[model samples]
Target: TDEQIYAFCDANKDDIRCKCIYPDKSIVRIGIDTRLPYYCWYEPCKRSDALLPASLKKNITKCNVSD
Candidate 1:
């Protein structure tokens, strides 16, 4: 019952997560919301760790996430 915030965060707290609460906040960072920003999955940033945390991944896979 307490892990909901993690969901909120995982779903909400992307470094670009500012995008979540305001994808187009403009400074807002990436302002790229909708789904995983498609960053670390493999891109120019070379950031393998930018993806959601294990806790978030677990929730997306197990919790009452979209599916």
Candidate 2:
């Protein structure tokens, strides 16, 4: 399951991924020594045609990011 999750996150590289890799530097492996349930966080920044490409917009309006 972790392997599949890792692959899915790898496919969508733009999104933020969180995982703890051990000294061996492997992801698919998991145990008490390994971090289980590999998952990703997708929080895309806001976009507006009126603003400049490099504009830094912080805390935009509301927290409803699904729009």
Candidate 3:
């Protein structure tokens, strides 16, 4: 089955993740959310990333893989 993988990031801590939260807020660094954004294989096919950190790549493959 084909799958799509998704990774979300935002400057906002609120649930409105796609939009900029508090645009007035000072210098929001990328990926600095209230919590790490949810990461998943959102697509039908596997999301492959050999270029990522070894630990992260391992985790994604192990965690997101489906039977």
Would you estimate the TM-scores of all the predictions?
0.24, 0.24, 0.25
lDDT of 1 at 65: 38
2 or 3: which has the higher lDDT?
A: 3
Residue 7 accuracy (lDDT) in model 2: 58
> Residues 1-67, candidate 2, lDDT per residue (tens digit)?
4566545545655443322211123433432244332211112222222221111222222222333
Pick by TM-score: 1 or 3, better one: 3
lDDT by residue for model 1 over 1-67, one digit each (tens)? 3355445655664554322222334322341443434222223223343334455445445533342
**Residue lDDT tens for model 3, 6-49:** 13323323433222222223323322453322232322112342
Clashing pairs in 1: 9-13, 14-17, 19-23, 23-31
Worst 10 residues of 3 by lDDT: 1-10
Clash count per candidate? 4, 0, 7
